Structure formats: C-alpha cells, structure tokens
Design a binder for this molecule. Structure first.
Ligand SMILES: [Ca+2]
Ligand SMILES: [Cl-]
Length: 448
C-alpha cells in the first residue's frame, strides 16, 4: 500500500521519469513532488523556481513534452506526480523568463499591475500581530497577487485544471499562509474534482495566521514535527516520543504532511540547526526510521544535493542517470530516498498500513525504544553508546524475518540479503543492536 512520497528537489524531468521506472515504483513510493514546472526567472540559484513569469511549462527541469512524458512514465510505473504551485505571487523586479517572456513593474504576460495588491513590505513582527500585512503585503519583494480577484482565481484554477488533464494528481500550494484561507476556498470551487492538495503553512505558535485555518481546504505541512523530532534526537530522550503527535499539540494526523527536513529548512529558512539533514549521516537514518515507522501524518522523504554550505546554490551540473552511471551518494545528488535505512523504512510503512496503532511501547527511559504495529511489524532504535540487548514483547508470529533496514527477502522467500531477526514462540525478540543502529521487521518479509 502506498504511504510515502518523495521530494526530488531540482531533478529534471528525464531523471524523474527514469527514477520512477527503475526505483520509485518497484520500491513502493506513492508519489513525487517535483520542482515548479512553470516559467520562472533566469539564473542558476535554486530559488529562481519560486519567482514565476507565466504558467507555460518551460522551466529549468525541461519543456512541456518532457514534462508530459514524465507524468506518463511515472503513472505507468504506479507513481503519482504532485506539482509545486505558486498561488501567492509572481517574480520581483524585471527581466526574462525561461520561455522567453519579459516582465517588469508588476506587468507579466498574464497579469497587469491591477491584478496585484498595492506594494508594502512584510516585516518580521507582522507575523505575530498583523494578519492583514502577512496576507496583503509582499514576501521579500515578490509581487503579491490579488487572490480575491475573480480574474486571478480563474487564471490559477485554469493552470491547475490543465495539469490535471495531463495527469498530475496533486498540488503543493506554496506560501499558503500569505493567502487568506477564504481566497483558497474560492479558488478550490473552481478546481475540477478533488486532487490531493497540501498547503505550506509554517506555524510554530504565536502567529496571527494559524495552520488550523487551512484544515478545510486540504492537508497542511506540520512544521512542529520536523523541529521537535530534530530537537529530541539531538538534545532529548527518545523515550519522550511515546505520545508524539496530537499529544504534543500537533494538528490531526489525517491532516498533516510531515518530514525530517525539507528544501527550505535544510538551508535555515523556517528551521534552526536542530533540524536533521543528510549531513548528519546515521543520525538522519535513525530519524527517518522513526518517522516512517510511527503512525502519524503523511511523510515525504527528502532527496537532496550536496550544496557545499552555499545556501543559494542550484543543483549539480550532471544528471542523476549519466550514461549508465548513477550520480548518487557522493558530492552531487545525495539520493536519500535510496539509502538502505530510508527505503527499508518506506517498505515498513507500506506493509503495516493495516494497523495504525503503536503497540507494546518499550524504552530504557532514555535513548533506546521499541514498538510494534500490532502483528504487522515491529522495530527498535538504539541511540545509546552500548548494545541494546533487551528482550521485548511483540504481537508477531514466531519465525525468521529479514531486518528490512539492512536487506530484503529474496524472490523465493528462502533467504535475506541482510541480518535475520528471530521472533521466539512466545512472540518475544532477544534484541542485539549495536550503538546507533536499528531493526525493523514486518509480516511480509518472513522467511521460508
Ligand atoms: Ca498574499
Ligand atoms: Cl513543504
């Protein structure tokens, strides 16, 4: 069962199409969040993608034909496409777009100066005490669209509907906090059917505009999850996570899109140093294992490129699928969605989707935890400096299972490629996990 999606940050359409066929589909990922496919300003920075010029599908990722080809191939492989949609603004200043269109002084090929709110700057203190400025003024000089206008709404809705006709199944509404929830409700009344929609709203508390305001228009990104998870794994006790979710004050599970990190917060935008990223290696492995095994939210695995400390830098000069060579795991694309622990976590979530409860929670009061998903699976994380050798109770059938974080079951189900975990006749497991390691077993990776 599909339960997890992935953000292929800055991946071109050819690399995504191939990735769907060779890896994402066979591994069970549900969908791919692509970078903005519409026309945007020229320049190599990654953020040029967030300054639209028009709604033509000609971007750094490729052209319209390549985009349509990617949707078809991913769809045939059983993987959906979610498009990052800019509903709040257009590009700042003036210049040229990736399809040749010119713009300047709030004048674009599809919008006139009268289609935007009058210019004013959003100050940091506005977030806490002025919802009007937050939703009507400019986010770092980006031309703020008049989202209450029937013309503006029809124009964005027409773009969304065209993407659906091509086969796109979902949308990420970028900068949703800067658009009145009522403007979004009006917009949705113009969108055909009911696609998957998730809204980016950063709400850590004490904001004039809250995340809860967007619960009726679709899913909402729960940024408290990324921040708290990262803070607990780095500075707290894993034992505290026994009631992670609504118990910590997060939004309802069924409404939340969660993650260990995203493209903004791994760069310091909307997240501090406590956010765990690929740079943290095994720490990142363990945090993803927890998120993918824990039954809260709809997770999205991050897929990055090594930016070498340059937070403005665009992606690698080489494609992921380069002449039969895979440019992953080194100083170009990191390909976290391929990391053993992470893909194994996705496999675990997909195979325990019939039991969303946390059963038989166990911990050593600090950094060692273990819990099940009923008789569908069980897992354990050891973040201490000594071996975890406790005997834990499970609801699983006795037998031998592959630790899916370190390998998989063979086609004939007679062997595993990694270590074997034994569930005794009484349902217990005698753990043997080294420092900073983990194990996860599920009912569909049982031997012989
Ligand atoms: Ca706005
Ligand atoms: Cl996001």
């Amino acid at each position: 069962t599909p339960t997890t999606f992935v953000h292929l940050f800055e991946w071109n359409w050819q690399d995504v199409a191939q990735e769907c066929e060779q890896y994402l589909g066979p591994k069970g990922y549900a969908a791919v969040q692509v970078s903005p496919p519409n026309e945007h300003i020229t320049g190599s920075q990654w953020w040029t993608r967030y300054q639209p010029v028009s709604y033509e599908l000609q971007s750094r990722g490729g052209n319209r034909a390549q985009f349509i080809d990617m949707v078809n191939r991913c769809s045939a492989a059983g993987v959906d496409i979610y498009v990052d949609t800019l509903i709040n603004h257009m590009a700042a200043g003036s210049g040229t777009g990736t399809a040749g269109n010119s713009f300047g002084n709030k004048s674009f090929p599809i919008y006139s100066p009268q289609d935007f709110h009058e210019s004013c700057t959003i100050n940091n203190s506005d977030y806490g005490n002025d919802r009007y400025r937050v939703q009507n003024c400019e986010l770092v000089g980006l031309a703020d669209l008049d989202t209450a206008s029937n013309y503006v709404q029809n124009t964005i809705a027409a773009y969304i509907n065209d993407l659906q006709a091509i086969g796109v199944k979902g949308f990420r509404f970028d900068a949703s906090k800067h658009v009145a929830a009522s403007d979004i409700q009006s917009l949705m009344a113009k969108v055909n059917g009911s696609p998957v929609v998730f809204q980016e709203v950063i709400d850590q508390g004490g904001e004039a505009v809250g995340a809860s305001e967007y619960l009726s228009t679709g899913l909402v990104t729960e940024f408290k999850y990324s921040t708290e998870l990262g803070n607990t794994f780095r500075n707290g006790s894993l034992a505290w996570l026994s009631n992670f979710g609504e118990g910590w004050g997060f939004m309802p599970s069924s409404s939340a899109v969660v993650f260990v990190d995203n493209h903004d917060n791994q760069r310091g935008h909307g997240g501090a140093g406590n956010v765990i990223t690929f740079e943290d290696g095994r720490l990142y492995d363990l945090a993803n294992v927890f998120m993918l095994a824990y039954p809260y939210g709809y997770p999205k695995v991050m897929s990055s490129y090594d930016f070498h400390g340059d937070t403005d830098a665009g992606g690698p000069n080489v494609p992921v699928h380069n002449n039969g060579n895979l440019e992953c795991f080194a100083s170009n694309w990191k390909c976290e969605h391929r990391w053993s622990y992470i893909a194994g976590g996705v496999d675990f979530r997909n195979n325990t989707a019939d039991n969303w409860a946390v059963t038989n929670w166990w911990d050593n009061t600090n950094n060692q935890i273990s819990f099940g998903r009923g008789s569908s699976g069980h897992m354990a994380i050891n973040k201490e400096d000594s071996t975890l050798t406790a005997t834990v109770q499970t609801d699983m059938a006795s037998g031998q299972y592959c630790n899916v974080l370190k390998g998989e079951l063979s086609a004939d189900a007679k062997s595993c490629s990694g270590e074997v975990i034994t569930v005794n006749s009484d349902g217990t497991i005698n753990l043997n996990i080294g420092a900073w390691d983990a194990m996860a077993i599920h009912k569909n990776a049982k031997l012989n």
